[PDB]
Amino acid sequence: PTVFHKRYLKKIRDLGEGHFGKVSLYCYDPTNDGEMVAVKALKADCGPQHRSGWKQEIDILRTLYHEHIIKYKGCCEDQEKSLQLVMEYVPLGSLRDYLPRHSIGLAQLLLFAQQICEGMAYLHSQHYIHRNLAARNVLLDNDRLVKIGDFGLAKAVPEGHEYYRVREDGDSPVFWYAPECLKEYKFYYASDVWSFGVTLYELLTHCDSSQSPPTKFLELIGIAQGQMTVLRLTELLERGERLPRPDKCPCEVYHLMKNCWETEASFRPTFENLIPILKTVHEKYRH
Numbered sequence: 001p002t003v004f005h006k007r008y009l010k011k012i013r014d015l016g017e018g019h020f021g022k023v024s025l026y027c028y029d030p031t032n033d034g035e036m037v038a039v040k041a042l043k044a045d046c047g048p049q050h051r052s053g054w055k056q057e058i059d060i061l062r063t064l065y066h067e068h069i070i071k072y073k074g075c076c077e078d079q080e081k082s083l084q085l086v087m088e089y090v091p092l093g094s095l096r097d098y099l100p101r102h103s104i105g106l107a108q109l110l111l112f113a114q115q116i117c118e119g120m121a122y123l124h125s126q127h128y129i130h131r132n133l134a135a136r137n138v139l140l141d142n143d144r145l146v147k148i149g150d151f152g153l154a155k156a157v158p159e160g161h162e163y164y165r166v167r168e169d170g171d172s173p174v175f176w177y178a179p180e181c182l183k184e185y186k187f188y189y190a191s192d193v194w195s196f197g198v199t200l201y202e203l204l205t206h207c208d209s210s211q212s213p214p215t216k217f218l219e220l221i222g223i224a225q226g227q228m229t230v231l232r233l234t235e236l237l238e239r240g241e242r243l244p245r246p247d248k249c250p251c252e253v254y255h256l257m258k259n260c261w262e263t264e265a266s267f268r269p270t271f272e273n274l275i276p277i278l279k280t281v282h283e284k285y286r287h
């Protein structure tokens with residue numbers, strides 16, 4: 001029932017450096033005696049009705065619940081032609097910022113991966129694709145539980161269809177994307193698994209920038225971060241080239257990543273399949 005009024009939100013601090021756009025930590029103290037929340041300011045000068053249509057769409061995300069998916073709390077308009085999106089505050093933040101500055105063993109990294117899969121399996125079973133699964137978008141709470149964030153690309157998959165058709169050739173996170181996404185503009189549940197493979201790669205490199213997928217992929221092609229084309233990447237992937245085995249990364253775990261990187265969407269493992277395979281692997285490496 002909670003509706004959020006701009007007159008009871010006191011700004012504490014910016015969040016995420018700049019990597020999530022303009023997100024800030026607020027205190028919500030209405031009665032003046034208060035909960036902590038993150039607020040995303042969203043430019044929405046697109047005509048009043050288009051703006052409402054986006055609110056309706058965002059609002060539907062609130063009907064999702066899973067402990068490894070961030071909780072979107074509400075979407076208010078500032079009619080200043082912008083939308084204010086209120087969500088739970090996830091205090092340790094992004095794995096991309098967290099993993100470099102903390103000692104985290106193989107068992108714990110595998111535990112993160114199983115949590116992500118569990119949140120993604122739920123999402124898939126609710127008939128949604130995420131389209132933006134990367135380590136930057138996986139947040140960590142205080143008990144080191146994963147919460148998947150940034151649903152700014154998420155989409156309901158239409159009844160009777162096994163893919164969503166991406167329109168628009170815009171800013172794409174291409175280095176996390178399956179070839180069917182890159183070439184044909186089709187996004188399947190199986191395409192989110194490809195992105196998982198890349199996220200798994202990320203964790204096991206400890207989100208080391210120099211081993212990062214854009215860095216690595218540009219090197220395997222040859223040319224620099226500026227001459228880069230989707231076409232050049234697609235061809236490399238078809239020829240069967242892949243991101244390399246990360247340092248100290250077990251061969252069964254790498255094979256996992258490679259299974260997520262099968263060219264043919266249909267032969268990739270499902271999240272629901274990946275959960276137990278990751279439970280089993282984590283058991284070998286715990287304690």
Ligand SMILES: O=C(Nc1nnc(Sc2ccnc3cc(Cl)ccc23)s1)c1cccs1
Nearest residue numbers: 015016020038040089090093149150151152
């Ligand atoms: O923007 C969105 N979704 C986000 N989902 N997660 C974000 S970032 C963040 C959240 C909570 N807590 C945080 C804590 C720290 Cl330290 C750093 C960042 C966060 S923005 C959108 C969702 C849908 C449309 S747009």
